[PDB]
């Protein structure tokens, strides 16, 4: 099974700097040419830059939007690669993905999960959350106020999933809201327990909040 | 510099239908020596990392579907998907890898189905918000279509601090869901009684009216 996961992403300010790194596993790293893509919230895919493989020397190569700015390395023994940003701008904000290149035969990327870079002098700020309680009946979550993107919600630690859609948070007043809503059976609530799980990254906030009627 | 298009930038598609895309290429991405075409084609869908789909822009990717086809050659290229399925919502993007790698500005795919009126819900402030001085009414207006709506907030009568979201289209039944948030101060709050999330949309000329009053909570 092949793995890709990137790390590194987070809020920077202006001017600044930041260094990304993508784990790989379940393949010969060293076969194979890696790129970085990334893409700001709601807009296309840009390539950014690849390095090549073993056989290539493991060069590199850059788009002419990042050459100059941005500096991609690899760490051959454990299987790592990097991406340097300098210099950081607001278009700079965007999620960012490791990707499986070249082999030297095929022409394809056979990607990470991806990792959010925002660039803003606005401070960390964590979320609060708020139980949202009232045949089948709807509960939820509601992610108030905070700073950067993301967080992430689940319910009954990832066992609903089914029935539950989750907001796309809006930025209002400099500060994010979200909120999520599960529906299950009425038999089961408040029966049984239902607590959505959300986590805020940027300020390793970690909330299990029941929902009680 | 090679400049990737695609077109269309967005279109509709109900389940059982063909979907035809096309992509096109400043430069000619046929390789002489190798006599294939760099074009490869991404699915990516809602909340997910792109997959490949397609690659030499004829070669199906193992475990994709066989719906999935792609076709053309030198400046100009087509992904057809036959049959359309609800999962098949997504962003298709395609990519040049002739010199160094460039991606396509993407076409969004949606499904079109059958009209769905929403289920409404509406929830009062907690007292864990209440405690610090703001009052948050938020309605969820689930599983509707088409897109569009009119969410109305009512207190104590009167129509009136709104956050609203939709969801992307979901993958299982075509529909969307919408969150309506009113925020207040808790002192603004307490001055009134009734507060009423009123959602018309074209399922119904009645709106679906859901309220609560503060006496009751
Ligand atoms: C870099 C100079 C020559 O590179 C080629 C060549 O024969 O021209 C091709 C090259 O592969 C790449 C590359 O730039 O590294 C990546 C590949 O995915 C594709 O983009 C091709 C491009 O289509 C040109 O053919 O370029 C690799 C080298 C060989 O490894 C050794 O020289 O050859
Ligand atoms: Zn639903
Ligand atoms: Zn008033």
């Known amino acids: 099974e092949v793995k890709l996961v990137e790390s590194g992403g987070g809020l920077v300010q202006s001017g600044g700097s930041l260094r990304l790194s993508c784990a790989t596993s379940?393949?010969?790293?060293?076969?194979?040419?890696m790129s970085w893509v990334r893409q700001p919230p709601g807009k296309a895919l840009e390539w950014l830059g690849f390095?090549?493989?073993?056989?290539?020397?493991?060069?590199?190569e850059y788009s002419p939007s990042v050459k100059g700015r941005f500096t991609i390395s690899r760490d051959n023994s454990q299987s790592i690669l990097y991406l340097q940003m300098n210099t950081l701008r607001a278009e700079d904000s965007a999620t960012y993905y490791c990707?499986?290149?070249?082999?030297?035969?095929?022409?394809?990327?056979?990607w990470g999960q991806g990792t959010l870079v925002t660039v803003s002098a606005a401070k960390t700020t964590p979320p609060s959350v708020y139980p949202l309680a009232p045949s089948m009946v709807t509960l939820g979550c509601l992610v108030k106020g905070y700073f950067p993107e993301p967080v992430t919600v689940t319910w009954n630690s990832g066992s609903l999933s089914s029935g539950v859609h989750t907001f796309p948070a809006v930025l209002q007043s400099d500060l994010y809201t979200l909120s999520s809503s599960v529906t299950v059976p009425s038999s089961t609530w408040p029966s049984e327990t239902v607590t959505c799980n959300v986590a805020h990254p940027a300020s390793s906030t970690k909330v299990d909040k029941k929902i009680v009627p | 510099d090679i400049v990737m298009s695609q077109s269309p930038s967005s279109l509709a598609v109900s389940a059982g239908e063909k979907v035809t895309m096309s992509c096109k290429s400043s430069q000619s991405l046929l390789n002489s020596r190798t006599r294939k075409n760099y074009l490869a084609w991404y699915q990516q869908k809602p909340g997910q990392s792109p997959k490949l789909l397609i690659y030499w822009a004829s070669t199906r990717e193992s475990g994709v579907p066989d719906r999935f086809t792609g076709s053309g050659s030198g400046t100009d290229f087509t992904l057809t998907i036959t049959s359309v399925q609800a999962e098949d919502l997504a962003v298709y993007y395609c990519?040049?890898?002739?010199?160094?790698?460039?991606f396509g500005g993407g076409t969004k795919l949606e499904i079109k189905r059958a009209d769905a009126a929403p289920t409404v819900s509406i929830f009062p402030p907690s007292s864990e918000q209440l405690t610090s001085g703001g009052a948050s009414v938020v309605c969820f207006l689930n599983n509707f279509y088409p897109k569009d709506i009119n969410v109305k907030w009512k207190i104590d009568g009167s129509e009136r601090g709104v956050l609203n979201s939709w969801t992307d289209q979901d993958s299982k039944d075509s529909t969307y869901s919408m969150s309506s948030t009113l925020t207040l101060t808790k002192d603004e709050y307490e001055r009134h009684n009734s507060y009423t999330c009123e959602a018309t949309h074209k399922t119904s000329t009645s709106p679906i009216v859901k309220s609560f009053n503060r006496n009751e909570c």
């Open positions: 990707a499986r290149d070249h082999d030297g035969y095929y022409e394809r990327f056979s």
């Open positions: 379940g393949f010969t790293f060293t076969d194979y040419y």
């Open positions: 990519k040049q890898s002739y010199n160094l790698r460039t």
């Open positions: 390095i090549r493989n073993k056989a290539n020397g493991y060069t590199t």
